[PDB]
From a paper:
To provide proof-of-concept, we have applied this bottom-up approach to identify compounds targeting the first repeat of the Bromodomain and Extra-Terminal domain 4, BRD4 (BD1), whose role in cell proliferation, apoptosis, and transcription has made it a very appealing target. To address this challenge, we have conceived an innovative strategy that explores the chemical universe from the bottom up, performing a systematic search on the fragment space (exploration phase), to then mine the most promising areas of on-demand collections (exploitation phase). A basic implementation of the concept has enabled us to validate the strategy prospectively, allowing the identification of new BRD4 (BD1) binders with potencies comparable to stablished drug candidates. MDMix simulations of BRD4 (BD1) resulted in the identification of a polar interaction with the Nδ atom of Asn140 and a hydrophobic hotspot in the vicinity of a cluster of water molecules at the bottom of the BRD4 (BD1) binding site.
Second, we also sought to screen and experimentally confirm the predicted binding mode of the selected ligands by X-ray crystallography. To obtain additional validation of our bottom-up approach, we also screened the 85 compounds purchased via X-ray crystallography. These could provide additional positive compounds and an additional layer of validation of the binding modes proposed at the docking stage. We were able to obtain compounds 50, 92, and 94 bound to of BRD4 (BD1). X-ray diffraction pattern analysis revealed that compounds 92 (IC50 = 621.8 nM) and 94 (IC50 = 27.9 nM) bound with the expected binding mode based on the docking calculations. Compound 50, which is a weak binder (IC50 = 1129 nM) derived from drug 1 (ABBV-075) with known binding mode, surprisingly showed engagement with BRD4 in an upside-down pose with respect to the parent compound but retained the pharmacophoric features observed for the remaining compounds. None of these compounds were considered DSF/SPR positive hits. Nonetheless, the corresponding IC50 values were obtained by TR-FRET.
Author numbering: 42 to 168
Write the structure that this text describes.
Amino acid sequence: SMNPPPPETSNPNKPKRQTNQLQYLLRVVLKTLWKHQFAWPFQQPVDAVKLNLPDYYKIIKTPMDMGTIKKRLENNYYWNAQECIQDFNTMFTNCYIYNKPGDDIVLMAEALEKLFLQKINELPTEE
Ligand SMILES: CNC(=O)c1ccc(-n2nc(Cn3cccn3)nc2-c2cn(C)c(=O)c3ccccc23)cc1
């Protein structure tokens, strides 16, 4: 079995900025979710080899995880907040697509997503 290459966290061809909204996404949003008791399945790319999920990357064609997001924020990969928000939403959606309703992992994603929505609700206005 083989994992795909992880999502890009570095790309000199891609435009980027440092902004207060992206700062908030790191300092408030990412940090809040990262420390949660249920964060651990979402802190790195799904290792379909070690986890014995050979169909994972047949079903999930746009993988995303908070490890990748954390790196993208820290390494200034993004142009705007929407790109980062999209990554979070992709991660949650992937979880719900792959896993069965009522699985623990779905409940775990839900707990993180609740907090995500609470924090994004107060995304600051652009400076
Ligand atoms: C973003 N990541 C995922 O989407 C993900 C990651 C791991 C798992 N795998 N892989 C195993 C190992 N295995 C293979 C065959 C039998 N067992 N078991 C789980 C797992 C299943 N279920 C129902 C859960 O609720 C759950 C909650 C937290 C962590 C793992 C799980 C499922 C989804």
